[PDB]
Structure formats: structure tokens, C-alpha cells
Amino acid sequence: SSFERFEIFPKESSWPNHTTTGVSASCSHNGESSFYKNLLWLTGKNGLYPNLSKSYANNKEKEVLVLWGVHHPPNIGDQRALYHKENAYVSVVSSHYSRKFTPEIAKRPKVRDQEGRINYYWTLLEPGDTIIFEANGNLIAPRYAFALSRGFGSGIINSNAPMD
Amino acid sequence: YANNKEKEVLVLWGVHHPPNIGDQRALYHKENAYVSVVSSHYSRKFTPEIAKRP
Asked: d(Cα A86, Cα A79) in Å, to the nearest integer?
């Protein structure tokens, strides 16, 4: 019934100790490399990846769909190159959700030109609840969220037909 | 505890998550704790998560 894309974490603000200019050739837009419009790739600035602890409290009388990611580098060298720490943790906590994520370095079969994988996670913040992101590495932070008013049960139609 | 009542037993427990590291130490005297619950068909290992919840 409602779909409001809103900036949960501004790119120019909200990350003053990290590089937010991560792009990948697997997500190339019009030749040049780009990245997701709703996610932000945080890497290290001034040779360090500082501890991140950022919280958002829901204030929109609507459940908010928050999407984040966890990066799994292909080898240990890339892990040290981007996040400057052989092991990392991503704690995403809320009132009714709690998950710890640990990077899993492995050389996976090359898909979309890459061997490393990014696992995508989502949750629904209830109206009057907060989500806390803590991370010392491997965090694909949310940038745009979605306030979602729900409606009648429906589905997805898989078809190739004109629209009138 | 070993079941000797010939009936299924409902066992309830809980794990605490203090708001700040100060409380963790004050009450539990350890920065990082572990809670393992093991049964023949259940096995879980909980870690306290410290956060400033509302």
C-alpha cells in the first residue's frame, strides 16, 4: 500500500572514517564500474578500518525493510588489503532479530568475473524499534531503506506479455 | 538433568544481554561469556550481545 524509499544512512555523512567509493566491474553501468544504489561498500581509509557502531530507530509508523550485506573475500590477501584484519565480525541486532556474521574466505568458482561472494540479508523493523550495526570489517552497509505498508496477499507473475 | 518421568519434560531457560560492558563485568565478571545447552536432539551455544537497546 505504501513504498517509500528513504535514505537510512547518508553517503556523504554517516561514514566519516571509511572509504565509501567501492565499485566492482561485475556491477558495471554504461561501461564504467558501479555498485548497488541501495547499498554502500565500506572499505578502509588512512590505512585502518575503525570500529563501526551505528543505530537507527524507526519513527515512520511503518515497518522498514532494511537490507545489508556481508563480504566474503576470495583470499586472505584481499581481506587484509580492504579491511586490514584477518578476521572480522558483523553484529546486526534489533528487538526481534540478532545475527553475528563471520567472513568465510574461500576461492569460490568465478561467477560474474568474481570469486569472492557477498551475502545479502534483510529484516523488517517494527514501528518503534531500532537496529544496531556493529562491524570491524566486511560490511555492505544500508544506504536506502523502504517503509512498507502491507496489503492483500498477492504474487509474482512470470510472463512475457504486453501491458495495457 | 536426566529424564525419569516417562513423559516429555518442558525445560525453559534464558540468556542475559546487559546493556553496557560495565554491567556485564559487575554481575558476571567476564567480558565474554558462553551458554551451552546440549541435549540428545538439541544443541545450542549462546553468546551475550552487549547493546544499548531502547
From this structure: 6
Three-state SS string over B3-54 comes to: CCCCCCCCCCCCCCCCCCHHHHHHHHCCCCCCEEEECCCCEEEECCCCCCCC
* Cα–Cα distance, A61 to A131 (Å, whole number): 15
Kindly give the pairing relationship between strand A139-142 and strand A39-41: antiparallel
Give, as one character, the DSSP assignment of residue A3. Answer: E
A&B contacts, CB < 8 Å: 18
Mutation target to probe the B interface, by most B beta carbons within 10 A, among A52, A54, A55 is A55
Helix boundaries (H) for A49-124: 76-83
CB contact A89 to B (< 8 Å): no
* Cα(A27)–Cα(A36) distance, integer angstroms: 8
Experimental method: cryo-EM
What are the residues facing A139 on neighbouring strands?
A70
User: Which grid cell sits at B15?
Assistant: 540468556
Chain A stretch 95-114, residues whose beta carbon is closer than 8 A to a beta carbon of chain B = 95, 98, 100
Q: How many CA atoms lie within 13 A of A112 on its CB side?
A: 9
